Design a protein around this ligand. Structure first.
Ligand SMILES: C=CCO[C@]1(C(=O)O)C[C@@H](O)[C@@H](O)[C@@H]([C@H](O)CO[C@H]2C=C(C(=O)O)O[C@H]([C@H](O)CO)C2)O1
Ligand code: MG
Ligand code: MG
Ligand code: ZN
Lengths: 219, 215
């Protein structure tokens, strides 16, 4: 059959530096009749469809920045990005079309940047939710780097770990940061037994956690 | 301008069938092979099959993973491509893309649709609850889109006019329902003096919601 394999699985590179990734086929993709390698590269940015970058191994599609260059032949191919930019964050796929078509497993390119502290915001349950018997408290931790972050919820000063939804965005295409949402969900009955609700974020950018709180009596 | 637009994705039970369509314009349809490709959430692209162009008698080929179970066809009068899926299973849950393929010369998929999401599951359709997130130089506001099934939902802010400084958090499945949230950050001088509204849609339940963020 034709097995396509890519390397690395993932990597991070700083803006302005060079990126090299590789694509192997289990069989030569060089068509002896047309003298071309039937190997294309696609870029898939977060939440988008794949976009064609390179085909016949080295032909750069119209409108693709000159920083993207495909090379190689036979069973081994390379995509090189010189002077990488924040917007190049994406999964890159190679694809053979020598015998039907088969995609490689992708290489995830992340962007390294300077550490950045999160901006933290807390939100109490809406009256339209409380009326239904539930109470979700939301904390946004926005625009930080690197991705690793700790959030604790404290209720009247005591840590709680049950009832929590955490979700990270993909890296931002403009500023190369991450954001995270943390949602604590309680019943209205339990919500009404306590006053102080606190989101505490600990990130490598400070030894001091960022603390956001609200008090039910103040709503 | 070349346009490819998939439709027909949604929730379907295990063992069921579903047919996707892909409307096209902006190129000579019969000149081109057309492919289908799918992507399970967070996983790699998988080529499924193609239908050849008129020069090659519009014949079909399929990956071993779906041969005998999926069928590709095309309407050459209206320039629509179809994928019939049968005996669906959980492993078929994925975003499905149509892509323009070979023209007898170039080896490339020039163009891809936006994709249509298929979910194979026994769970029922549940519309979201949509809750405003208002605070108790910049101000951050949000919407909580809670307890829906299946994916996806769409969230915009002020009908898409606020796009900068928006973060929409990927949905998370807990106890058989999805929840997501979306934040927007705007100058404090502009809210609440100017209106901020999240617009949420859940196509599975035809839900359309506009939630004004009120101080
Ligand atoms: C024209 C048919 C071949 O094209 C495809 C196919 O399977 O339809 C699709 C294309 O993207 C390539 O994968 C080729 C593959 O390179 C084989 O190409 C051939 C084989 C044939 C054939 O008739 O089966 O004919 C081609 C030329 O037209 C003959 O000069 C070369 O497969
Ligand atoms: Mg941001
Ligand atoms: Mg045939
Ligand atoms: Zn309690």
């Amino acid at each position: 059959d034709i097995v396509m394999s890519q390397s690395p699985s993932s990597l991070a590179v700083s803006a302005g530096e060079k990126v090299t990734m590789s694509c192997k086929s289990s069989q030569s993709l060089l068509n002896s009749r047309t003298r071309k390698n039937y190997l294309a590269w696609y870029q898939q940015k977060p939440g988008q469809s794949p976009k064609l970058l390179i085909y016949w191994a080295s032909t750069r599609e119209s409108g693709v920045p000159d920083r993207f260059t495909g090379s190689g032949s036979g069973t081994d191919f390379t995509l090189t990005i010189t002077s990488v930019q924040a917007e190049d964050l994406a999964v890159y796929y190679c694809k053979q079309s020598y015998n039907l078509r088969t995609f490689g497993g992708g290489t995830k390119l992340e962007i390294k940047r300077a550490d950045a502290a999160p901006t933290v915001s807390i939100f109490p349950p809406s009256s339209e939710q409380l009326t239904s018997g539930g109470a979700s408290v939301v904390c946004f931790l926005n625009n930080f780097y690197p991705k690793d972050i700790n959030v604790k919820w404290k209720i009247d000063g005591s840590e709680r770990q049950n009832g929590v939804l955490n979700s990270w965005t993909d890296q931002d295409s403009k500023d190369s940061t991450y954001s995270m949402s943390s949602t604590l969900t309680l019943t209205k009955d339990e919500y009404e037994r306590h006053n102080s609700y606190t989101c505490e974020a600990t990130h490598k950018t400070s030894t001091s956690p960022i603390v956001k709180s609200f008090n039910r009596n103040e709503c | 301008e070349v346009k490819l637009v998939e439709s027909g994705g949604g929730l379907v039970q295990s063992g069921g069938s579903l047919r996707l369509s892909c409307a096209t314009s902006g190129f000579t349809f019969t000149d081109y092979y057309m492919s289908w490709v799918r992507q399970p959430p967070g996983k790699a692209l998988e080529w499924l099959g193609f239908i050849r162009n008129k020069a090659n008698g519009y014949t079909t080929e399929y990956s071993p993973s779906v041969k005998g179970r999926f069928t590709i066809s095309r309407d050459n009068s209206q320039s629509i491509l179809y994928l019939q899926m049968n005996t669906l299973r959980a492993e078929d849950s994925a975003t499905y893309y149509c892509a323009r393929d070979h023209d007898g010369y170039y080896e490339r998929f020039s163009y891809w649709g936006q994709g249509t999401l298929v979910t194979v599951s026994a769970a029922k359709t549940t519309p979201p609850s949509v809750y405003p997130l208002a605070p108790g130089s910049m101000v951050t506001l949000g919407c909580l889109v809670k307890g829906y099934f299946p994916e996806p939902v769409t969230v915009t802010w002020n009908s898409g006019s606020l796009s900068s400084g928006v973060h929409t958090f990927p949905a998370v499945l807990q106890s058989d329902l999805y929840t997501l949230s979306s934040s927007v950050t705007v100058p404090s001088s502009t809210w609440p003096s100017e209106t901020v509204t999240c617009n949420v849609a859940h196509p599975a339940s035809s839900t359309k919601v506009d939630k004004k963020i009120v101080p």
